[PDB]
C-alpha cells in the first residue's frame, strides 16, 4: 500500500538522507512524509514513484509516510540512526 525503500539507513549527524516513498496505487490523492526536517524535492518522473531529499539529520527520527489510496489511509515508516565521535 505504501513502500519506503530506504528502510534501514545509517548516516552521520548533519548530512543528507535520500528517502524514497511511493504507494501501490495509480492515483495518490494525498501522499507525503511527516517529519519536521528540511526537504525541497527530488526529481523523479512518474506519477506514482517519489523521492524527498531530507537534510540536516541531527537526532534519531521516524518519519511517517501516508498515502491516500481509495482503500483508507496507509502507513509506512523508515528507521534512521546517527553517528558521533
Amino acid at each position: 500500500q505504501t513502500s519506503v525503500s530506504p528502510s534501514k539507513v545509517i548516516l552521520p549527524r548533519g548530512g543528507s538522507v535520500l528517502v524514497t516513498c511511493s504507494t501501490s496505487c495509480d492515483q495518490p490523492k494525498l501522499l507525503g512524509i511527516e517529519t519536521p526536517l528540511p526537504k525541497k524535492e527530488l526529481l523523479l518522473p512518474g506519477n506514482n514513484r517519489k523521492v524527498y531529499e531530507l537534510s540536516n539529520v541531527q537526532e534519531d527520527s521516524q518519519p511517517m509516510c501516508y498515502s491516500n489510496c481509495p482503500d483508507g489511509q496507509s502507513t509506512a515508516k523508515t528507521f534512521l540512526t546517527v553517528y558521533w565521535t
Partner: protein, 280 residues
C-alpha cells in the same frame, strides 16, 4: 427553423448597423440584410442535429480492457485473470474533447460492452463458451484481490453476466454526481495545507483529479481455466443522454499528456505556418 432573410433594398440614412464596438464585450450583430441588398428567402433548414442531445448522441469509446483465462501458476498470471478499471471519461481523447467544451454537465450515462475473444496458443486443446462478469464497484466496496475471492459474488454491487456470442450488454447509469453537475474542470484542491503542519502535504495533486471517484469496473471470466488460453478484449462505451451543459469553454487544441489539462512540450505548435498573409 433558422432565420429567414427579408426582402430589403438599399439605404442612405443615419441608422448605421455595420459599425459596432467590440470593446463593449458584445459580438457582432449585423445580419446580411443590413449591409447589402437581399431577396426574400424562406428558410426551412433547422438546427435539429446540432443540439446537445444529438451532439452527444453517440456511443463513444472510453477504454479497452483485457482479461484472459488460463491455468495460472505464477503471480503475474493470476493478475491477468481479472482487470479492475477506474471509471473515467479521460482515457481517450475524443469523448473527452467533446465534453471539455463545457464546464459543468448533467447527464444520465448509458454504457454498452462490446467484447471479443481469441485463442492464445494453437495446439493447447479447446474451450467451452464463456460468461463474463462485469461488476460496478462503488467507492468503498472491496476491490477484488484475486479473481475468485469473496468480492465477486456481488450481493449488492450491480453485476452483469454476458454470455459470449450474444448481443452486447447495455445498461443506463443515472446522474450519480454528488454536486449538482459533473465538474469537468475543478480549479481547487481536496484540502487546505495549514500553517506549520508537520504533515507536509507538499505533494497534493492539483485540480480535477482529487475529487472524482466514480467507481471501479472489475471484470473477471466466470469460467474456470480451460486447456486453451483465451485472451479477451473488452471495449467499455459511454453515451451521455438527457444531456444538459453549462458555461462553455474553448475546445482542446494541443494534445493531452494526462488526466489534467496539461500539455506536452513537443506538441505546443498546433498551427501550420502559411506562406504569407495573402494566400487564398
Amino acid at each position: 427553423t433558422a432565420q429567414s432573410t427579408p426582402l430589403t433594398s438599399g439605404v442612405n440614412s443615419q441608422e448605421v448597423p455595420a459599425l459596432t464596438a467590440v470593446e463593449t464585450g458584445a459580438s457582432g450583430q449585423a445580419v446580411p440584410s443590413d449591409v447589402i441588398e437581399t431577396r426574400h428567402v424562406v428558410n426551412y433548414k433547422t438546427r435539429s442535429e446540432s443540439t446537445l442531445e444529438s451532439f452527444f448522441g453517440r456511443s463513444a469509446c472510453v477504454t479497452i480492457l483485457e482479461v484472459e483465462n488460463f491455468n495460472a501458476t505464477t503471480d503475474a498470471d493470476r493478475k491477468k485473470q481479472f482487470t479492475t478499471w477506474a471509471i473515467t471519461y479521460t482515457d481517450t481523447v475524443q469523448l473527452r474533447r467533446k465534453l471539455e467544451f463545457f464546464t459543468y454537465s448533467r447527464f444520465d450515462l448509458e454504457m454498452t460492452f462490446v467484447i471479443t475473444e481469441r485463442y492464445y496458443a494453437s495446439n493447447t486443446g479447446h474451450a467451452r463458451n464463456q460468461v463474463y462478469q462485469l461488476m460496478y464497484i462503488p467507492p468503498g466496496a472491496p476491490r477484488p484481490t484475486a479473481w475468485d475471492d469473496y468480492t465477486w459474488q456481488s450481493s449488492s454491487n450491480p453485476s452483469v453476466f454476458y454470455t459470449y456470442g450474444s448481443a452486447p450488454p447495455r445498461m443506463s447509469i443515472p446522474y450519480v454526481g454528488i454536486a449538482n453537475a459533473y465538474s469537468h474542470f475543478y480549479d481547487g484542491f481536496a484540502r487546505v495545507p495549514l500553517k506549520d503542519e508537520t504533515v507536509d502535504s507538499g505533494d497534493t495533486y492539483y485540480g480535477l483529479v482529487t475529487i472524482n471517484d466514480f467507481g471501479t469496473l472489475a471484470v473477471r471470466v466466470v469460467n474456470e481455466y480451460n486447456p486453451a488460453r483465451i485472451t479477451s478484449k473488452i471495449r467499455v462505451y459511454m453515451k451521455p443522454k438527457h444531456v444538459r451543459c453549462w458555461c462553455p469553454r474553448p475546445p482542446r487544441a494541443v494534445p493531452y499528456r494526462g488526466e489534467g489539462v496539461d500539455f506536452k512540450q513537443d506538441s505546443i505548435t498546433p498551427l501550420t505556418a502559411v506562406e504569407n498573409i495573402n494566400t487564398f
